[PDB]
Amino acid sequence: ELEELEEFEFKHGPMSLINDAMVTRTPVIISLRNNHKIIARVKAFDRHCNMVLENVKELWTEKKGKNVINRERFISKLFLRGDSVIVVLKTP
Amino acid sequence: LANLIDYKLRVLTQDGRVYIGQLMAFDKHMNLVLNECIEERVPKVEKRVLGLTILRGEQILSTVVEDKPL
Amino acid sequence: MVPPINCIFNFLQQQTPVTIWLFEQIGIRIKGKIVGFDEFMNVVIDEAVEIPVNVEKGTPLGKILLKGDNITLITSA
Amino acid sequence: YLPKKVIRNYPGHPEGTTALKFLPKTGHLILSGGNDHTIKIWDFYECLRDFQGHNKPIKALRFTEDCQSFLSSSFDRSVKIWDTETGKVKTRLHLNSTPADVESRPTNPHEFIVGLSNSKILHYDDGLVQTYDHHLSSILALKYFPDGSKFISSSEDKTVRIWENQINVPIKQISDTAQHSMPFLNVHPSQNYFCAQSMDNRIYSFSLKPKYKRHPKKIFKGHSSAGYGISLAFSGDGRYICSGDSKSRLFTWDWNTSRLLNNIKIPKPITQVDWHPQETSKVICSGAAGKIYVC
């Protein structure tokens, strides 16, 4: 029984918020390594925190020679490498 | 990629340097070996000829195919 | 003639105050006392004091588990 | 790991191929001394050369740890040291008796030991150096210690004598009332055990201690090794034992329980058995056929 020791440490370990956001279908905000804050819903979780998202609302920052402006785009379907993942934060 | 053996590979490494050479072999880690490889930095301009070189898959960002064989 | 996992633990038995360097961050160093470690050099340290390299101050941080992937160079005093 | 299938052909002599060994730590070559013809080398598949200069069959073909030249023990009273690269004449020991296995000390290419069948053993350099006369019978097989510096001899008598680096006098002579003989013996590669065939169809295993006494239950019984000069073998870092028999069968063995594992039906008495120092599961065997079946 290899998988049950894999999945129950998965269950109440640090992968809970990626497992809880998806089950309750609540958007979690994800800040990546290049400051692309991503607020989105979760479709699936992986070992590497690879994530498939839905209705992605990526928000980033562009700096120029005056007041910084905010650039944001809506991505309907997204697959995300877990390497950029810093913070998974669930909003209530 | 085993399909892509013995072609000229325009392979783009991490620092923006681009290698062009004939693919001798690859492996699991994408370690590449390049016959008559040339190295160019800033992009015809700024090119260096290396010859039979290795290229470790740690540094490759992408590889594209340049030309057919003989 | 000492492999390094046997050369971490002599900081641990003798309980020496230890200066530890970070990895690609040269402005800050950490000094403290080695209280625990593992096989991947993730180090728990006691009496942890930051060292701004650029007069060398300190902010006392006490108990720190420093994750080993930023650990560079292990010394003492 | 265990050998289980008879994989490759390697058709050597149509005669016996009476000696098989490996280059130590570089499993590239083998050796094969047939009855009528001369020595052949197979690779891995390929062939390299003959070694003309023999007339009679060959008992054993032992390398050095310098590995450039092996040592031929022919029945024709002549010991020849052949290079594996060119195959030239270093020495030609014309002897008095039919020599047994002819071995070399792991330190020097100079130091070089020839067993005889007139109960003597002669040490040499690059040219007699020192005799050895304590066996009463024809001497059958020889070994050494880790990195040499001592020496192991066993005969048609039941005795095994540990001689030293150029010293006549045995430290231990190993004899009981029930031992047949010790016709062949190889060092277990942890360099602390002492395995040897014996013609009660059994492979005894002694220690390499000052208190040199044997250890019980490490005796490998299920054989027909009674009337043939059959070899022993050892895997990488000592995981198993392979040994041929006269049933045209090869028998492998464990260590802690020492029980039968694979009774293969290889197509004539299987005598010469070697492992690879590189491939951790495959075993080269040859009987009296000449076709070198690899398991």
Binding site: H12, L89 | - | G36, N42 | -
Partner: protein, 73 residues
């Protein structure tokens, strides 16, 4: 000799602080769960930007790839 997995699972339910590898961001909160591979899960997380507070965030996860250290306050 507090080894790290004995150190940190005993450090569960304590208001711990975590400095990231970027030093632009820290997080203070109660550590809820930690696997063998040192992923962190903090509740009532307050974000500390350059040592000064950014704001209250809530139930948070921190990847293993960014934990510079972790401290007990």
């Amino acid at each position: 000799p507090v080894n790290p997995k004995p150190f940190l699972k005993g450090l569960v339910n304590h208001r711990v602080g975590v400095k990231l590898k970027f030093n632009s961001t820290e997080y203070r909160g109660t550590l809820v769960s930690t696997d063998n591979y040192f992923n962190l899960q903090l509740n009532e997380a307050e974000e500390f930007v350059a040592g000064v507070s950014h704001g209250t965030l809530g139930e948070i996860f921190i990847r293993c790839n960014n934990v510079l250290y972790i401290r007990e306050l």
